[PDB]
Write a protein that binds this DNA or RNA. Structure first.
Ligand code: ZN
Ligand code: ZN
Ligand code: ZN
Ligand code: ZN
Lengths: 107, 101, 95, 83, 101, 93, 97, 82, 107, 93
DNA sequence: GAGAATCCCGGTGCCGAGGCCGCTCAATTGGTCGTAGACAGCTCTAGCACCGCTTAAACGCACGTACGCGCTGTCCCCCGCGTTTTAACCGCCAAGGGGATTACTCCCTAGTCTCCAGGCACGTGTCAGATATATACATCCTG
DNA sequence: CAGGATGTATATATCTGACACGTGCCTGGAGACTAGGGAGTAATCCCCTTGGCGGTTAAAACGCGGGGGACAGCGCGTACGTGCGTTTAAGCGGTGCTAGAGCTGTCTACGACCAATTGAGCGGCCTCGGCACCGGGATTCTC
């Protein structure tokens, strides 16, 4: 019969089959359920979609058509939940958010 | 914009409460799916189920009253759209309170 | 002639809106090699490895300086002092 | 030739630039020496972990993968260089 | 707490819906305060509702407002972390489409 | 030797959300690192859950619990919803 | 009558509570607080005695560490009194805020 | 019932005792309220993780194992309970 | 075949066999070598020996004969390397170190 | 059923170090938790090393490198010495 | 020196720590078999060392100024303590909810084989943007 | 308050090197089928958790006098920001060697797996000594 990808079957862009292989060969468990890779691929796809949407919005604000590490850093650090998820994560070429303590402001 | 005149029956599906079948009185919205009902209707339904009556989305884990909010904008919207709604509701309120102190 | 503080604020805005590395590449590479000489002799370093080390160093130092500035502000000052850095590291758990 | 006093290559203007990126308005004179010491300690730790990884890898070069792995080990996980 | 029904609300009868075919008229300024975006001061488009306060905005307006300004509501100053604190409201989308096509 | 990465999938998601916006090589590498990190975190939590419950298999329930444990609040809620729809669509075939 | 100057009894309490090792929060109020907080997640929940004991031990250890950091902040600010600003500084530097 | 208004279970002498064990000589008046808020947040997080573990276990009793696992996830691993 | 335990063969008190079984069933790798459990058991035995020695010294400096969590906490936090190893570790019924900042004391 | 632990081995080590000193139940639980935590740390480190170098085996070299990565300074040095001595004693006997 | 806190010494009791016994299940021993990787060999690439030119940036110095560091004064707010009250705690009881155990079976995933197309390395045209220059606008400082 | 000086975002023009798209292919993903063990389901035991009741206080709550510390204002002088000329070496670009990263073939020793077995380790029980608590002096700290 015609070969149909599991990603297309589950309506996902992420590689469900590759995720299943990585789970199996990743020494995570003796056995891996059939529905396990689909859920993980969906979660990864949603997280990627959120971060890419925020970074693209930042790029559009900066009048740029290319997502850069600065836009990724702005997207991650301007979101409280994403910042908590990536609290220990350092993004290369991302810089820091513009933030000056009010006491340092001129009086 | 110009003056608009539209039929009420075309607006009934978006101003009626599913649980009671009537118009939105003291509209209350569950925020996990943004579904609006009458305050009494949703509150009374919530002691027997923790799921949304319409789309069966779990409103809350334990206390569904923690995820319902008063929909003031929609409530004044249904008052403006439905003629006589506010006066009729106040009339029943005063009539009920005219006999019980 | 600008008053003190205005140029400092301008530099703060400029270096906060930019993402380039702030430590000189060759001195940082030489420092990395000197430090690594104590662990294994005749080591080689990838350019990407040195760049990653530098990015980590700048990020850690910028976070430490943010915490130090918060300590200085807490102490009712706008000047950072070494005891601010020491307090920040002690609270973080690095000392 | 064993390198010596290369920490002096971490210049006072560079430390000031890092502080400015950190939002510091005024910097004292001892901050430069304290920051040099702190950076030396941090680099010593990270490079020690990376060199240990390289030695286990039966290799004579420290790679960006080893640096990233050491940073992830120390809770300072770094993106952009693989992993 | 703050949800116990009053004596009247214990037994209030449903509002009978107007089933007869009569049309209602609305001026272009009738529902201004209810269908106006606090940001763009125009009619809503792709409505998003904050969970904590039930306040209505256009999608683009609220996204740029959160992305640029502070993470608080433009109307009631209550904090919202990100776009996931809001949900689209197809009911308001339908209402807008039928009222002002 | 081929070095697999999530580059094409992240690009497809980017084309889905922002059709006219491209990406840089550094941004692709950062996103690949993020995907790998989230993958290993979720997989490790699922493995720990299965070990604690004396279960030898990683299931959608374990993945859902790991997602709920790690992602905070609204991110966890939306990720759980998306995984539920994906699993339902995959099994309804 | 005899009256100790301020600070002496405080230092004595510091010494006695730093030498001693029993739990400082009351068992029943802490258990009721734990149950009230857990009411939001699940219903008709049960707790083992060891579970609430572990919760109390962890909470007291966390609060003691936070108070040590807060005292360090207060001393750094040239003060002896802890303050909410000190607590907020300690938490922000630790990364909890 | 509801089990409402129990956060005040932590008394001012209890917070003072914790501060004394922490080496604090002098305590401000709002320290008690701030500590109550911080403890409430910490307990909310830890108990949320523990209840998630219990629910995944298909049980109804929060166990010392669940609490220990939650604390270990939070980076606050606790010894003495298994 | 006179059966000789692996722990006695390696001169260790710790259960080499139990460590090997945990290495198999711990889902760490597809296969586990032969010397790895012995090495891990030796490391665990050394750490236990150091901790118990320091705790016994602390108890003898207290004039008691039974090691308690207070003594264990004192030993852990008084050894710098052990404290660094267990920095994020909370010992139940351990208490805190007797110390007061100098500014808090009169002079 | 049976719940295995390191109580007897911790007691043997305690009798080896301090013949006249005993231990309490809470202290034994503390020691069991410590041994389990260190075991899981070293094993996870060795597993990560083996995956990193595309190796399917955990050997004494992997355990040694894991110990060197985790334990600080003198503790790491003495742990490596003890592990090496045990390994050579095993291969000799 | 008066008074409160705490250490040192001696009795008493109690409860759990440690030792002993019985069982059982998993660690040992022995053997086989499959393959992970150790080792040797080869390739090619990118890391190191050196050179020279340009100019970006660091160094050193002068100078002013504003801010950190005492110093004082006040006032208000925690501390210490006595009295009242209140509910925590200990001991005991009782019911049953569900955690844990055992048995049965069923269906779901590891495993293998064959087939084929999805993605990866590679190549190339092209345009997004780093750069350059000029200009008008926003900040700042001093007279 | 205004005018000069300076920094900065806006408006065009370059040209380019990294990015998006076309293509060969090959290795990993997909379809089919088997089997055997993990897990779901049902029944049962009793552990332990929830709930309550009665004293007994230990401890919490409240109030009051006040002393000391937080806060604010003040002054000074020194250390740091700012600017400028000079000197240093970083950055760029090209060259050349080669140590070592990476890939490949072989075959070998090492680890998984299975059977029999037996002894270490766990569950249960018992007793006696260490420690908590008691009270009385004696020392120490405080005011
Ligand atoms: Zn209704
Ligand atoms: Zn709904
Ligand atoms: Zn709008
Ligand atoms: Zn609002």
């Amino acid at each position: 019969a015609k070969a149909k990808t599991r990603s297309s079957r589950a309506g996902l862009q992420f590689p469900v089959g590759r995720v299943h292989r990585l789970l199996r060969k990743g020494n995570y468990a003796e056995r891996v359920g059939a529905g396990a890779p689909v859920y993980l691929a969906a979660v990864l796809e949603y997280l990627t979609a959120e971060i890419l949407e925020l970074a693209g919005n930042a790029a559009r604000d900066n009048k740029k058509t290319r997502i850069i590490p600065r836009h990724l850093q702005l997207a991650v650090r301007n979101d409280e939940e994403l910042n908590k998820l990536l609290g220990r994560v350092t993004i290369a070429q991302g810089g820091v958010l513009p933030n000056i303590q009010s006491v340092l402001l001129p009086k | 914009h110009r003056t608009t005149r539209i039929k009420i029956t075309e607006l009934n599906p978006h101003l009626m409460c599913v649980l009671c079948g009537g118009y939105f009185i003291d509209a209350t919205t569950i925020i996990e799916c943004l579904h609006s009902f009458c305050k009494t209707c949703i509150v009374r339904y919530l002691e027997t189920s923790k799921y949304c009556p319409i789309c069966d989305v779990q409103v809350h884990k334990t206390r569904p009253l923690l995820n319902i909010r008063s929909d003031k904008t929609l409530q004044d919207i249904v008052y403006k759209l439905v003629p006589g709604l506010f006066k009729n509701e106040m009339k029943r309120r005063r009539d009920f309170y005219a006999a019980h102190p | 002639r600008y008053r003190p503080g205005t140029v400092a604020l301008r530099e703060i805005r400029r270096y906060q809106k930019s993402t380039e590395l702030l430590i000189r590449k060759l001195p940082f590479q030489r420092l990395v090699r000197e430090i690594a000489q104590d662990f294994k002799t005749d080591l080689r370093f990838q350019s990407s490895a040195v760049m990653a080390l530098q990015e980590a160093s700048e990020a850690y130092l910028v976070a430490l300086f943010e915490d130090t500035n918060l300590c200085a502000i807490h102490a009712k000052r706008v000047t950072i002092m070494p005891k601010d850095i020491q307090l920040a590291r002690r609270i973080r758990g690095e000392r | 030739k064993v390198l010596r006093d290369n920490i002096q290559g971490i210049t006072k203007p560079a430390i000031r630039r890092l502080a400015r990126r950190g939002g510091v308005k005024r910097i004292s004179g001892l901050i430069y020496e304290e920051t040099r010491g702190v950076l030396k300690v941090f680099l010593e730790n990270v490079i020690r972990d990376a060199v240990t990884y390289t030695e286990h890898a039966k290799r004579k070069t420290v790679t960006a993968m080893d640096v990233v792995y050491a940073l992830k080990r120390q809770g300072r996980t770094l993106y952009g260089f693989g992993g | 707490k703050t949800w116990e029904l009053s004596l009247y609300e214990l037994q209030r009868t449903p509002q009978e819906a107007i089933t007869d075919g009569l049309e209602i008229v609305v001026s272009p300024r009738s529902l201004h305060s209810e269908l106006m975006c606090p940001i763009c001061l125009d009619m809503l488009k792709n409505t998003m509702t904050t969970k904590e306060c039930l306040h209505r905005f256009c999608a683009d307006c609220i996204i740029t407002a959160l992305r640029s300004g502070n993470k608080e509501c433009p109307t009631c100053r209550k904090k919202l972390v990100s776009k996931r604190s809001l949900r689209p409201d197809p009911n308001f989308d339908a209402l807008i489409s039928k009222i002002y096509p | 030797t081929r070095k697999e990465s999530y580059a094409i999938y992240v690009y497809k998601v980017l084309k889905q959300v922002h059709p006219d916006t491209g990406i840089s090589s550094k941004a692709m590498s950062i996103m690949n690192s993020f995907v790998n990190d989230v993958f290993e975190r979720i997989a490790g939590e699922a493995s720990r859950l299965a070990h604690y419950n004396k279960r030898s298999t990683i299931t959608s329930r374990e993945i859902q619990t790991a997602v709920r444990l790690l992602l905070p609040g609204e991110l966890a809620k939306h990720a759980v919803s998306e995984g539920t729809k994906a699993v339902t669509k995959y099994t309804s075939a």
